[PDB]
């Protein structure tokens, strides 16, 4: 378990970093 | 202690999914 | 081992809260409601 857990955490971290990029972008497109 | 950890993870998963949906609709609305 | 995991899970929930606020303000900005 703990092993997968960490692995799933690394995955999550990457998911987030993508989303922040979408957001950063979207912000340029608006106000 | 471990089960808590796990509940935490499903939580993070559900919300991320929510967020990816919002972002979708926001694009639609501001674009094609 | 277990603590480090917990520490990182809280860091994640923090980040995630912040993005949800970002979203809220964007939604406002374009009139989503």
Curated annotation (Swiss-Prot), chain A:
Gene name as annotated: GCN4
Domain notes: Residues 89 to 100 and 106 to 125 define the N-terminal activation domain (NTAD) and the central acidic activation domain (CAAD) respectively, which can function independently to promote high-level transcription of the target genes.
Function field: Master transcriptional regulator that mediates the response to amino acid starvation. Binds variations of the DNA sequence 5'-ATGA[CG]TCAT-3' in canonical nucleosome-depleted 5'-positioned promoters, and also within coding sequences and 3' non-coding regions. During nutrient starvation (low or poor amino acid, carbon or purine sources), it activates genes required for amino acid biosynthesis and transport, autophagy, cofactor biosynthesis and transport, mitochondrial transport, and additional downstream transcription factors.
Family that this chain belongs to: Belongs to the bZIP family. GCN4 subfamily.
UniProt-annotated stretches for the region Leucine-zipper: 5-26
Assembly and oligomerization: Homodimer. Each subunit binds overlapping and non-identical half-sites that flank the central CG base-pair in the pseudo-palindromic motif 5'-ATGA[CG]TCAT-3'. Interacts with the mediator tail; the interaction with GAL11/MED15 is direct. Interacts with the SAGA histone acetyltransferase complex. Interacts with the SWI/SNF chromatin remodeling complex.
Source domain of life: Eukaryota
Subcellular location: Nucleus
Stretch of the intact protein here: 249 to 279 of 281
UniProt protein name: General control transcription factor GCN4
Post-translational modification: Phosphorylated by the cyclin-CDK PCL5-PHO85.
Induction: Translation is induced by amino acid or purine starvation, or during growth in low or poor carbon sources. Translational repression during nutrient-rich conditions is dependent on four uORFs (upstream open reading frames) present in the 5'-UTR of the mRNA; these promote ribosome dissociation. Translational induction occurs in conditions reducing translation machinery efficiency, leading to ribosomes scanning over the uORFs, and increased translation of the mRNA. The rapid translational induction is followed by transcriptional induction at later time-points, independently of the uORF sequences.
Upper lineage: Eukaryota, Fungi, Dikarya, Ascomycota, Saccharomycotina
UniProt note: phenotype after gene disruption: Abolishes recruitment of the mediator complex to the upstream activating sequence (UAS) of amino-acid starvation responsive genes. Decreases RNA level of genes involved in amino acid biosynthesis and cofactor biosynthesis during amino acid starvation or methyl methanesulfonate stress. Growth dependent on amino acid supplementation. Sensitive to amino acid starvation. Sensitive to purine starvation. Decreases cellular glycogen levels during glucose starvation.
Swiss-Prot record, chain B:
Residue segments, region Leucine-zipper: 5-26
Superkingdom of this protein's organism: Eukaryota
Coiled coil feature spans: none
Reported induction: Translation is induced by amino acid or purine starvation, or during growth in low or poor carbon sources. Translational repression during nutrient-rich conditions is dependent on four uORFs (upstream open reading frames) present in the 5'-UTR of the mRNA; these promote ribosome dissociation. Translational induction occurs in conditions reducing translation machinery efficiency, leading to ribosomes scanning over the uORFs, and increased translation of the mRNA. The rapid translational induction is followed by transcriptional induction at later time-points, independently of the uORF sequences.
Record comment regarding domains: Residues 89 to 100 and 106 to 125 define the N-terminal activation domain (NTAD) and the central acidic activation domain (CAAD) respectively, which can function independently to promote high-level transcription of the target genes.
Purpose: Master transcriptional regulator that mediates the response to amino acid starvation. Binds variations of the DNA sequence 5'-ATGA[CG]TCAT-3' in canonical nucleosome-depleted 5'-positioned promoters, and also within coding sequences and 3' non-coding regions. During nutrient starvation (low or poor amino acid, carbon or purine sources), it activates genes required for amino acid biosynthesis and transport, autophagy, cofactor biosynthesis and transport, mitochondrial transport, and additional downstream transcription factors.
Protein name: General control transcription factor GCN4
Species lineage: Eukaryota, Fungi, Dikarya, Ascomycota, Saccharomycotina
